[PDB]
């Protein structure tokens, strides 16, 4: 007798699906756990052509994004969020059971999830104490590695990776592996993007998204920026129609010049609010340390983090626990929402302090 | 010196991407090449929550579909079209380089495309002369096979697969492989669905879509119907957020009771129009034979098919060439559109006849 489960691939039977969920519908009122823009930006459909298939790579979207990012349109690929971008890279360059990817914890969990689901070895090299790259460590473990992911600014720690070190990492991987800079949060520190580096690195790829600064996580729309050769290789493994018409429709609107202007005003907003929360947190008794941030979230180390986490959780204030992340013992990640929401966190944290 | 291309997986470098495209914007006026409903059905967004991530499996969608299909909600999975459903199945049960899938040409090209892109052997067993299953042939080639795809009604031939043979196929794969019935066109012959067979076959999976009868190809929304055990296994390999909010929003509307009522009226419409075109075609001189259809498209064998195809193509009448499909030499697939469109085809075909 054979069960359906016995027919499933070994790795599929043993893996643990990504822990993104942690809901409590109608239970909590303050959501600061997913790094989402705190307020809804409305968009209405303009293309009533739903009976016809869309273009594999909607032209308006690709062009509007290329324009915004300062790259050529043939250097842009649009997918169902950065999540799909992460997948495509592995799908195109990593031979299952032979090649490996490499990332440096503590960082985003999707790199690992995709490789493990697909069947590609996950090589890890923890970042240093300040979360910068352990360059020497990476140099000793590139054998068999085809793709290297590096998040900058990094989630959940918040800091930018030393560009000087990216230079080094790019040199170590030249002719050996693709380096993928996850710039999910680059909108908050646009001047640190590596997008202008494409002309000197044929193996550099960049992940972008509309789920954060752009306040359109609901659209599940993201992009990959890379040289022609890389984009075309990725186009060979992508689904024929990855983007729905309604998403292409509104994404193109969100990327219009006026759209870009509003996105930037949302950024200035979050940055000013972030600096407020950062200043206040450091003064709260139960707060041991607040780490610098170039994003829309703050990592802080608390006294009895689990107790604090649970207390605020029961009060409708949902944060993201980082307690099990390597080196982040006692840390919680706080998303930057509105002034009201930041005040809720502050007032709740002040109620602890034992 | 190593090129980026040298870093790509071997199979990725050698594969040929699916041939779905064949556009000529503003050149042709009659589109009958993609099996799309001929007329746009409008839908407007109702959920302005785009700044927040959606549910991995939108509850309204899953439930409305389960209700429509007559199955339990825990037996339903929603994805970015049947295309993603096809992928998920392979991703969960086929070990790259070890297991294989099996399909029977001439049929849908995505099964092969996904397996080849992922790295899974494609086993083939052509259907008999009348396109029914070569049961004996399949029985001799199941070793190493984990997933079997069978399209019914079949694309591009149009006929339903003998249910009696599905019984046989399901018995041959019991405890060895998952049988996937692609019911992309079952809406046009709903009584032939295998959806009610779930209770007796733990390895049966069914592909469904909103791109055809439902006239919402633009939404890139599809489903997989299977027993709990199978759905849960597929849920372990699916992307965290496969459906965008706008798609979940409108798909749920399209699946409301009133939505179902309209879908069925679209079906009756296409069926009546199909029978018209079928009757007329058979009388046209350049038409050698018209094959029976239980879908929204007709396969017909022509005299000098390539010449006919090109002639109509230059007149703005776009059909789908099947000339390179195994056993379909001289056949073109005609999608059923409006009465006007059918008349255009008829009048154009009558202009040939040499
Ligand atoms: C949120 C986030 C993303 C975005 O993914 P999408 O699929 O585009 O929603 C990517 N990377 C990191 C590190 C993130 O935190
Ligand atoms: C059109 C079609 C589909 C539908 O795919 P979607 O991704 O849901 O648009 C599936 N199977 C066959 C055989 C088809 O012809």
XYZ file of C-alpha atoms and ligand atoms in Angstrom:
738
model
C 0.000 0.000 0.000
C 1.291 3.430 -1.085
C -0.041 6.753 0.133
C -0.190 9.867 -1.984
C 2.390 11.284 0.401
C 4.819 8.483 -0.589
C 4.615 9.721 -4.185
C 5.700 13.237 -3.204
C 9.355 14.237 -3.593
C 11.441 13.662 -0.445
C 12.398 17.324 -0.030
C 8.757 18.367 -0.476
C 7.669 16.005 2.298
C 10.330 17.311 4.700
C 10.225 21.057 4.105
C 8.469 23.644 6.233
C 6.521 26.277 4.272
C 7.554 29.936 4.727
C 6.262 31.540 7.927
C 4.785 34.717 6.454
C 1.336 34.302 7.972
C 0.482 35.313 11.533
C -3.037 36.701 11.373
C -5.730 37.458 13.936
C -8.494 39.038 11.854
C -10.563 41.660 13.693
C -8.427 40.954 16.762
C -5.641 43.464 16.351
C -6.026 47.033 15.139
C -2.364 48.034 14.665
C -0.583 46.169 11.851
C 3.198 46.746 11.820
C 4.436 43.257 10.969
C 4.710 43.001 7.163
C 6.546 46.203 6.172
C 3.506 47.482 4.288
C 2.743 51.154 3.660
C 0.218 52.029 6.445
C -2.426 53.603 4.189
C -4.380 52.481 1.145
C -3.762 54.242 -2.165
C -6.727 53.771 -4.493
C -6.608 52.644 -8.120
C -9.436 51.752 -10.515
C -9.286 49.560 -13.601
C -9.019 51.364 -16.936
C -8.677 48.416 -19.337
C -11.876 46.383 -19.765
C -10.290 43.672 -21.920
C -10.358 40.793 -19.446
C -11.552 38.264 -22.035
C -8.221 38.465 -23.892
C -4.845 37.175 -22.672
C -2.383 39.889 -21.571
C 1.119 40.471 -22.955
C 3.784 38.247 -21.349
C 5.648 41.442 -20.375
C 3.210 44.411 -20.418
C 4.946 47.144 -22.390
C 3.588 50.108 -20.418
C 4.776 48.541 -17.166
C 8.265 47.596 -18.373
C 8.805 51.037 -19.909
C 7.416 53.051 -16.988
C 9.598 51.074 -14.592
C 12.719 51.301 -16.771
C 12.139 55.041 -16.903
C 11.773 55.268 -13.146
C 14.784 53.059 -12.383
C 17.053 54.719 -14.901
C 17.802 51.560 -16.873
C 17.027 50.369 -20.393
C 13.766 48.498 -20.981
C 15.625 45.430 -22.268
C 17.229 45.309 -18.805
C 13.868 44.889 -17.080
C 11.691 41.843 -16.325
C 8.380 42.051 -14.464
C 7.060 39.232 -12.318
C 4.624 38.343 -9.590
C 6.630 40.173 -6.959
C 10.282 39.859 -5.986
C 9.259 36.420 -4.731
C 8.974 35.189 -8.316
C 12.184 37.005 -9.213
C 13.971 35.002 -6.524
C 12.536 31.797 -8.017
C 13.383 32.594 -11.639
C 17.035 33.139 -10.823
C 17.369 29.694 -9.210
C 15.219 28.055 -11.886
C 17.583 29.329 -14.591
C 21.060 28.926 -13.096
C 20.929 26.232 -10.394
C 21.000 22.578 -11.406
C 19.025 20.633 -8.756
C 21.224 18.335 -6.687
C 24.350 19.872 -8.192
C 24.497 23.644 -7.740
C 23.812 25.756 -4.682
C 22.733 29.240 -3.702
C 24.362 31.215 -0.913
C 22.943 33.774 1.511
C 24.088 35.402 4.744
C 21.800 35.100 7.817
C 20.031 36.744 9.468
C 18.148 37.854 6.339
C 15.014 37.355 4.151
C 13.629 33.805 4.300
C 12.477 33.377 0.699
C 15.908 32.678 -0.818
C 16.164 29.509 1.260
C 12.491 28.570 0.838
C 12.717 28.657 -2.972
C 15.986 26.744 -3.188
C 14.741 24.112 -0.725
C 11.413 23.736 -2.532
C 13.170 23.483 -5.920
C 15.863 21.163 -4.568
C 18.964 23.335 -4.535
C 21.550 23.312 -1.760
C 21.411 26.323 0.542
C 24.875 27.463 1.507
C 25.102 29.962 4.325
C 27.754 32.347 5.600
C 26.491 34.481 8.493
C 27.210 38.189 8.335
C 29.618 39.736 10.838
C 28.524 41.167 14.182
C 27.414 44.428 12.549
C 25.626 42.485 9.806
C 28.119 43.455 7.114
C 29.429 40.705 4.825
C 31.973 38.144 5.988
C 33.916 38.462 2.736
C 36.624 35.975 3.697
C 34.008 33.416 4.691
C 32.208 33.773 1.363
C 35.469 33.386 -0.559
C 36.020 29.956 1.024
C 32.530 28.667 0.179
C 31.712 29.521 -3.454
C 32.352 26.039 -4.910
C 29.154 24.824 -6.523
C 27.431 28.151 -5.881
C 25.613 29.657 -8.886
C 23.557 32.396 -7.263
C 24.377 34.669 -4.353
C 21.624 36.674 -2.679
C 22.440 39.764 -0.615
C 19.690 41.996 0.762
C 20.558 45.672 0.991
C 19.258 47.369 2.914
C 18.902 44.096 4.806
C 15.668 42.693 6.228
C 15.266 42.389 9.210
C 18.336 44.286 10.499
C 17.825 47.532 8.541
C 21.310 48.567 7.426
C 22.855 49.084 4.006
C 25.600 46.697 2.923
C 28.976 48.417 2.492
C 29.171 49.145 -1.222
C 32.932 48.615 -1.085
C 32.220 45.041 -0.067
C 29.754 44.543 -2.923
C 32.679 45.424 -5.195
C 34.653 42.630 -3.562
C 31.763 40.136 -3.702
C 31.217 40.952 -7.375
C 34.900 40.271 -8.056
C 34.838 36.927 -6.215
C 31.861 35.759 -8.290
C 33.033 37.051 -11.657
C 32.597 34.189 -14.106
C 31.349 31.847 -11.366
C 28.002 33.044 -10.046
C 25.242 35.606 -10.358
C 25.049 38.169 -7.560
C 21.498 39.224 -6.717
C 21.017 42.415 -4.717
C 17.529 42.379 -3.177
C 16.618 46.069 -3.217
C 13.115 45.587 -1.849
C 13.653 48.655 0.296
C 15.946 50.737 -1.877
C 13.209 53.333 -2.387
C 13.936 54.624 1.144
C 17.624 55.129 0.331
C 17.569 55.409 -3.505
C 21.092 56.802 -3.735
C 22.487 53.461 -2.545
C 21.060 51.387 -5.389
C 23.432 49.278 -7.459
C 21.288 49.773 -10.576
C 23.899 51.999 -12.165
C 26.509 49.265 -11.770
C 25.093 47.060 -14.534
C 27.561 48.239 -17.189
C 30.519 46.872 -15.243
C 29.109 43.600 -13.900
C 27.601 41.089 -16.352
C 26.567 38.831 -13.452
C 24.747 41.420 -11.336
C 20.981 41.127 -10.885
C 18.684 43.360 -8.830
C 15.346 42.619 -7.188
C 12.727 45.373 -6.988
C 9.142 45.513 -5.743
C 5.987 47.617 -5.576
C 4.881 46.007 -2.288
C 6.691 48.370 0.077
C 7.377 52.019 -0.664
C 4.930 51.890 -3.554
C 2.184 50.750 -1.188
C 0.879 48.115 -3.630
C 1.723 44.800 -1.982
C -1.782 43.823 -3.011
C -0.754 43.879 -6.660
C 1.906 41.191 -6.227
C 4.086 43.064 -8.721
C 7.872 43.088 -8.751
C 10.864 43.369 -11.096
C 14.363 42.094 -11.806
C 16.935 44.464 -13.271
C 19.902 42.955 -15.092
C 21.912 43.043 -18.323
C 20.225 41.847 -21.533
C 21.856 38.420 -21.454
C 20.566 37.697 -17.947
C 17.043 39.001 -18.546
C 16.690 36.930 -21.717
C 17.825 33.810 -19.877
C 15.226 34.462 -17.173
C 12.589 35.000 -19.858
C 13.185 31.423 -20.968
C 11.958 30.012 -17.655
C 9.131 32.402 -16.771
C 5.476 31.446 -17.164
C 3.922 32.591 -20.445
C 1.581 35.073 -18.707
C 2.922 36.009 -15.225
C 1.045 39.304 -15.002
C -2.731 39.717 -15.011
C -4.243 42.637 -16.943
C -5.665 44.405 -13.897
C -2.222 44.343 -12.245
C -0.450 45.560 -15.406
C -3.154 48.217 -15.693
C -2.785 49.739 -12.226
C 0.953 49.100 -11.924
C 1.467 51.200 -15.044
C -0.631 53.969 -13.444
C 1.349 53.771 -10.205
C 4.519 54.153 -12.274
C 3.411 57.246 -14.216
C 5.328 60.445 -13.465
C 2.630 61.594 -11.053
C 2.752 58.118 -9.557
C 6.468 58.389 -8.931
C 5.956 61.790 -7.314
C 3.451 60.343 -4.842
C 5.678 57.342 -4.092
C 8.478 59.684 -3.093
C 6.185 61.686 -0.862
C 5.218 58.408 0.826
C 8.945 57.785 1.342
C 9.647 61.176 2.899
C 6.635 60.497 5.105
C 7.869 57.127 6.360
C 11.417 58.379 6.850
C 10.316 61.292 9.058
C 7.988 58.976 11.026
C 10.768 56.391 11.334
C 13.193 58.877 12.859
C 10.463 59.777 15.354
C 9.893 56.208 16.518
C 13.642 55.558 16.624
C 14.240 58.569 18.884
C 11.381 57.608 21.248
C 12.139 53.868 21.456
C 15.717 54.382 22.697
C 14.334 56.166 25.759
C 11.905 53.421 26.761
C 13.030 51.301 29.785
C 12.312 47.874 28.278
C 14.302 48.851 25.161
C 17.955 47.799 25.329
C 19.076 48.983 21.890
C 17.714 50.315 18.604
C 19.630 49.563 15.418
C 20.115 52.065 12.598
C 17.705 51.798 9.685
C 17.552 52.849 6.046
C 14.097 51.279 5.574
C 10.459 51.377 6.726
C 11.077 49.113 9.715
C 13.137 49.174 12.901
C 14.941 46.328 14.651
C 15.279 46.715 18.401
C 16.521 44.473 21.203
C 14.211 44.255 24.218
C 14.340 42.909 27.750
C 12.163 39.802 27.835
C 11.363 40.206 24.130
C 8.907 37.301 24.069
C 6.913 38.781 26.951
C 6.833 42.190 25.273
C 5.864 40.610 21.951
C 2.964 38.700 23.518
C 1.794 41.673 25.571
C 1.542 43.968 22.541
C 0.135 41.136 20.441
C -2.766 40.734 22.870
C -3.396 44.506 22.707
C -3.937 44.449 18.943
C -0.402 45.629 18.217
C 1.188 43.119 15.838
C 4.950 43.171 15.445
C 7.353 40.674 13.878
C 9.328 38.423 16.242
C 13.016 37.921 15.266
C 13.908 36.003 18.400
C 14.778 32.808 16.489
C 16.900 34.570 13.856
C 20.651 33.915 14.089
C 22.237 36.586 16.311
C 18.946 38.429 16.803
C 18.124 36.930 20.191
C 15.787 39.371 21.944
C 14.936 41.384 18.827
C 11.577 42.411 17.385
C 11.090 44.092 13.977
C 8.744 47.105 14.044
C 7.245 48.392 10.814
C 6.869 52.144 10.492
C 3.212 53.068 10.162
C 1.400 56.325 10.978
C 2.119 58.748 13.822
C -0.908 57.350 15.656
C 0.352 53.802 15.256
C 3.873 54.743 16.370
C 2.364 56.378 19.440
C 0.435 53.182 20.194
C 3.669 51.189 20.164
C 5.483 53.769 22.306
C 2.675 53.963 24.886
C 2.384 50.169 25.035
C 6.128 49.659 25.464
C 6.188 52.236 28.246
C 3.528 50.176 30.049
C 6.033 47.305 30.355
C 9.526 48.133 31.715
C 9.656 45.745 34.714
C 36.607 33.392 -20.003
C 33.059 32.391 -18.994
C 29.883 33.921 -20.361
C 26.725 34.367 -18.354
C 25.195 31.819 -20.705
C 27.777 29.226 -19.548
C 26.447 29.639 -16.003
C 22.892 28.781 -17.066
C 21.614 25.224 -16.598
C 22.129 22.998 -19.659
C 18.421 22.298 -20.166
C 17.637 26.017 -19.867
C 20.157 26.838 -22.593
C 18.733 24.201 -24.955
C 14.989 24.599 -24.487
C 12.605 26.466 -26.753
C 10.064 28.666 -24.942
C 6.355 27.887 -25.486
C 4.950 29.186 -28.775
C 1.846 30.939 -27.455
C 2.562 34.296 -29.064
C 1.727 35.103 -32.681
C 0.599 38.718 -32.675
C 0.122 41.372 -35.344
C -1.313 44.311 -33.401
C -3.717 46.504 -35.389
C -3.076 44.222 -38.366
C -5.796 41.640 -37.953
C -9.363 42.325 -36.872
C -10.646 38.763 -36.319
C -9.006 36.946 -33.391
C -9.861 33.219 -33.263
C -6.501 31.759 -32.259
C -6.384 31.594 -28.440
C -9.741 30.030 -27.500
C -10.849 33.216 -25.754
C -14.473 34.265 -25.272
C -15.073 36.753 -28.161
C -16.516 39.578 -26.041
C -15.347 41.545 -23.023
C -17.250 41.167 -19.755
C -16.632 44.166 -17.506
C -15.629 44.086 -13.841
C -14.605 46.918 -11.506
C -12.527 46.712 -8.346
C -14.447 46.688 -5.066
C -11.609 46.212 -2.559
C -9.358 49.266 -2.163
C -6.840 47.559 0.129
C -3.888 47.335 -2.249
C -1.359 48.427 0.384
C -1.863 45.183 2.336
C -0.789 41.683 1.263
C -3.642 39.390 0.149
C -4.524 35.988 1.621
C -2.455 33.116 0.172
C -5.748 31.458 -0.850
C -8.528 34.107 -0.980
C -11.442 32.641 0.953
C -14.234 34.145 -1.157
C -12.661 32.739 -4.317
C -12.014 29.233 -2.973
C -15.531 28.995 -1.535
C -17.346 30.430 -4.563
C -15.463 28.031 -6.825
C -15.986 25.009 -4.559
C -19.675 25.865 -4.569
C -19.759 26.121 -8.341
C -17.756 22.934 -8.937
C -19.656 20.877 -6.407
C -16.623 19.965 -4.309
C -15.488 20.767 -0.777
C -13.399 23.901 -0.227
C -10.518 21.867 1.217
C -10.409 20.145 -2.190
C -9.689 23.407 -4.002
C -6.469 25.330 -4.723
C -6.374 28.583 -6.690
C -3.400 29.623 -8.782
C -2.250 31.896 -11.552
C -4.142 29.943 -14.179
C -4.068 26.246 -15.028
C -0.526 26.974 -16.199
C 0.611 27.287 -12.586
C -1.464 24.250 -11.651
C 0.484 22.233 -14.216
C 3.738 23.479 -12.663
C 2.770 22.814 -9.045
C 1.982 19.186 -9.766
C 5.441 18.549 -11.252
C 7.151 20.661 -8.590
C 5.623 18.487 -5.859
C 5.813 14.942 -7.231
C 8.591 14.787 -9.845
C 12.198 14.484 -8.711
C 14.364 16.222 -11.354
C 16.556 13.794 -13.277
C 14.746 10.841 -11.728
C 10.990 10.953 -12.300
C 9.029 11.689 -15.447
C 5.666 12.986 -16.574
C 3.663 11.414 -19.375
C 1.292 12.934 -21.926
C -0.316 11.805 -25.174
C 0.249 13.962 -28.304
C -1.208 15.789 -30.063
C -2.271 17.851 -27.032
C -1.610 21.012 -24.926
C 2.036 22.128 -25.000
C 2.437 23.365 -21.424
C 2.833 19.944 -19.780
C 6.037 19.389 -21.743
C 7.232 22.995 -21.403
C 7.010 22.903 -17.593
C 8.669 19.513 -17.213
C 11.460 20.480 -19.625
C 12.025 23.830 -17.909
C 12.043 22.172 -14.462
C 14.199 19.274 -15.653
C 11.805 16.340 -15.663
C 11.723 13.669 -18.354
C 8.802 13.951 -20.758
C 7.440 10.549 -21.653
C 5.019 10.411 -24.543
C 2.485 7.899 -25.815
C 0.540 9.218 -28.815
C -3.214 8.776 -28.758
C -4.857 6.406 -31.235
C -6.099 7.490 -34.657
C -9.318 8.888 -33.168
C -7.334 10.619 -30.419
C -8.568 8.295 -27.684
C -5.993 6.864 -25.267
C -3.593 4.103 -26.265
C -4.154 2.298 -22.967
C -1.846 -0.615 -23.762
C 0.929 1.773 -24.750
C 0.603 3.704 -21.492
C 0.689 0.489 -19.460
C 4.116 -0.363 -20.910
C 5.633 3.050 -20.130
C 4.730 4.048 -16.554
C 8.109 3.205 -14.965
C 9.507 6.358 -13.412
C 6.338 8.296 -14.217
C 4.878 10.318 -11.320
C 2.350 12.513 -13.097
C 0.113 11.765 -16.054
C -1.630 14.600 -17.877
C -4.707 13.943 -20.016
C -6.686 16.801 -21.551
C -10.408 16.196 -21.874
C -11.944 17.552 -23.892
C -8.596 17.606 -25.685
C -6.915 20.680 -27.158
C -6.491 20.959 -30.139
C -8.568 17.995 -31.395
C -11.827 18.805 -29.563
C -13.151 15.444 -28.376
C -13.885 14.055 -24.928
C -11.743 11.181 -23.683
C -13.720 7.956 -23.206
C -14.574 7.938 -19.514
C -14.320 4.145 -19.517
C -10.673 4.561 -20.437
C -10.082 7.078 -17.644
C -11.247 4.301 -15.313
C -8.557 2.076 -16.791
C -5.862 4.780 -16.657
C -6.748 5.505 -13.032
C -6.363 1.807 -12.216
C -2.968 1.564 -13.946
C -1.648 4.515 -11.925
C -3.126 3.553 -8.569
C -0.317 3.859 -6.041
C 2.194 4.842 -8.739
C 1.290 8.222 -10.201
C -1.070 11.170 -10.059
C -3.524 11.457 -12.945
C -4.287 15.045 -13.932
C -7.371 15.690 -16.051
C -7.030 19.113 -17.695
C -10.642 20.292 -17.806
C -9.861 23.704 -19.263
C -12.892 23.320 -21.492
C -15.204 21.258 -19.320
C -17.605 24.192 -18.980
C -18.837 23.444 -22.528
C -19.638 19.832 -21.619
C -20.030 20.035 -17.798
C -21.687 16.632 -17.506
C -18.423 14.958 -18.541
C -16.338 16.324 -15.675
C -14.474 13.874 -13.464
C -14.906 16.152 -10.432
C -17.366 13.763 -8.839
C -14.822 10.950 -9.062
C -12.605 12.292 -6.271
C -14.044 10.005 -3.583
C -12.840 6.893 -5.390
C -9.433 8.016 -6.666
C -6.894 9.416 -4.180
C -4.477 10.187 -7.034
C -6.858 12.120 -9.290
C -6.274 15.837 -9.847
C -8.267 18.222 -12.044
C -7.231 21.440 -13.763
C -9.776 24.245 -14.135
C -9.613 27.787 -15.494
C -11.471 31.080 -15.828
C -9.683 31.956 -19.093
C -12.100 30.245 -21.478
C -15.811 29.852 -20.837
C -15.590 32.378 -18.022
C -14.178 34.953 -20.432
C -11.531 36.143 -17.946
C -8.238 35.006 -19.456
C -7.037 38.462 -18.504
C -7.281 37.563 -14.829
C -4.784 34.701 -15.090
C -6.889 32.747 -12.593
C -7.194 28.976 -12.448
C -7.767 26.092 -10.022
C -6.777 22.534 -9.163
C -9.375 20.192 -7.698
C -8.146 17.186 -5.738
C -8.482 15.295 -2.452
C -7.264 16.996 0.743
C -3.966 15.118 0.828
C -3.042 16.235 -2.692
C -4.100 19.862 -2.244
C -2.107 20.168 0.981
C 0.975 18.748 -0.718
C 0.601 21.296 -3.522
C 0.177 24.053 -0.938
C 3.664 23.235 0.308
C 5.263 24.245 -2.994
C 3.117 27.208 -4.042
C 4.328 30.795 -3.731
C 3.201 32.536 -0.539
C 0.953 34.993 -2.430
C 0.028 33.609 -5.898
C -3.110 35.713 -6.288
C -3.243 39.507 -6.409
C -6.102 41.291 -4.622
C -7.665 42.737 -7.767
C -7.806 39.245 -9.310
C -9.248 37.672 -6.138
C -11.706 40.571 -6.023
C -13.143 40.199 -9.525
C -12.773 36.416 -9.691
C -15.001 36.161 -6.627
C -17.557 38.400 -8.382
C -17.405 36.305 -11.550
C -18.085 33.242 -9.398
C -21.145 34.636 -7.596
C -24.453 32.934 -8.392
C -25.324 35.627 -10.923
C -21.823 35.202 -12.299
C -22.347 31.497 -12.819
C -25.650 32.202 -14.563
C -23.946 34.511 -17.061
C -21.097 32.048 -17.643
C -23.608 29.394 -18.632
C -25.364 31.752 -20.997
C -21.974 32.421 -22.604
C -21.612 28.644 -22.984
C -24.997 28.139 -24.631
C -24.029 31.019 -26.904
C -20.722 29.501 -28.009
C -22.217 26.040 -28.430
C -24.972 27.276 -30.767
C -22.430 29.363 -32.728
C -20.050 26.393 -32.864
C -22.660 24.106 -34.395
C -23.278 26.811 -37.002
C -19.643 27.080 -38.063
C -19.268 23.292 -38.032
C -22.245 22.841 -40.372
C -21.003 25.542 -42.789
C -17.324 24.507 -42.850
C -18.063 20.937 -43.996
C -19.645 22.343 -47.157
C -16.698 24.532 -48.142
C -14.575 23.155 -51.057
C -11.152 23.672 -49.460
C -12.369 21.862 -46.318
C -11.586 18.139 -46.338
C -12.954 17.222 -42.908
C -14.283 18.785 -39.710
C -13.772 16.926 -36.444
C -16.390 16.719 -33.695
C -16.035 19.198 -30.851
C -17.183 19.548 -27.255
C -15.378 22.893 -26.838
C -15.171 26.489 -28.104
C -12.867 25.609 -30.996
C -12.983 23.454 -34.117
C -10.225 21.390 -35.715
C -10.520 20.956 -39.464
C -8.291 19.462 -42.150
C -7.810 21.649 -45.226
C -6.369 21.305 -48.706
C -3.108 23.246 -48.755
C -3.566 24.196 -45.092
C -0.491 26.434 -45.010
C -1.731 28.434 -48.000
C -5.174 28.818 -46.438
C -3.630 29.779 -43.098
C -1.463 32.478 -44.689
C -4.277 33.794 -46.875
C -6.640 34.313 -43.932
C -3.777 35.577 -41.784
C -3.088 38.359 -44.286
C -6.806 39.268 -44.268
C -6.825 39.928 -40.523
C -8.284 36.515 -39.727
C -5.973 34.825 -37.218
C -6.315 31.092 -36.712
C -4.052 28.567 -34.989
C -1.882 26.356 -37.216
C -1.684 22.676 -36.110
C 0.258 21.543 -39.150
C 3.320 20.506 -37.108
C 1.326 18.606 -34.471
C 1.708 14.812 -34.567
C -1.003 13.352 -36.826
C -2.582 16.751 -37.480
C -0.922 17.349 -40.840
C -3.128 19.798 -42.744
C -5.168 20.896 -39.723
C -5.988 24.367 -38.420
C -7.732 25.088 -35.086
C -10.560 27.644 -35.326
C -11.832 29.339 -32.187
C -15.555 29.998 -32.002
C -16.215 33.721 -31.816
C -19.303 35.738 -32.795
C -21.683 35.104 -35.694
C -20.010 37.958 -37.573
C -16.578 36.457 -37.017
C -17.742 32.979 -38.052
C -19.166 34.500 -41.220
C -15.814 36.165 -41.927
C -14.067 32.798 -41.731
C -16.707 31.106 -43.900
C -16.614 33.833 -46.571
C -12.806 33.842 -46.603
C -12.561 30.059 -46.900
C -15.048 30.095 -49.762
C -12.743 32.536 -51.577
C -10.057 29.820 -51.710
C -11.099 26.353 -52.988
C -8.635 25.950 -55.901
C 8.997 42.405 1.354
C 10.195 41.961 0.723
C 10.289 41.674 -0.629
C 9.152 41.808 -1.617
O 8.536 40.748 -2.273
P 7.343 40.885 -3.261
O 7.117 39.509 -3.826
O 7.728 41.826 -4.459
O 6.065 41.292 -2.472
C 11.480 41.246 -1.180
N 12.558 41.116 -0.380
C 12.599 41.359 0.930
C 13.901 41.161 1.582
C 11.371 41.811 1.536
O 11.366 42.062 2.819
C -6.286 27.470 -22.485
C -5.950 26.264 -21.803
C -5.713 26.195 -20.440
C -5.793 27.370 -19.492
O -4.712 27.929 -18.821
P -4.790 29.161 -17.876
O -3.419 29.305 -17.272
O -5.793 28.885 -16.698
O -5.077 30.438 -18.716
C -5.391 24.994 -19.838
N -5.317 23.883 -20.600
C -5.522 23.817 -21.916
C -5.400 22.483 -22.521
C -5.863 25.054 -22.574
O -6.073 25.035 -23.864
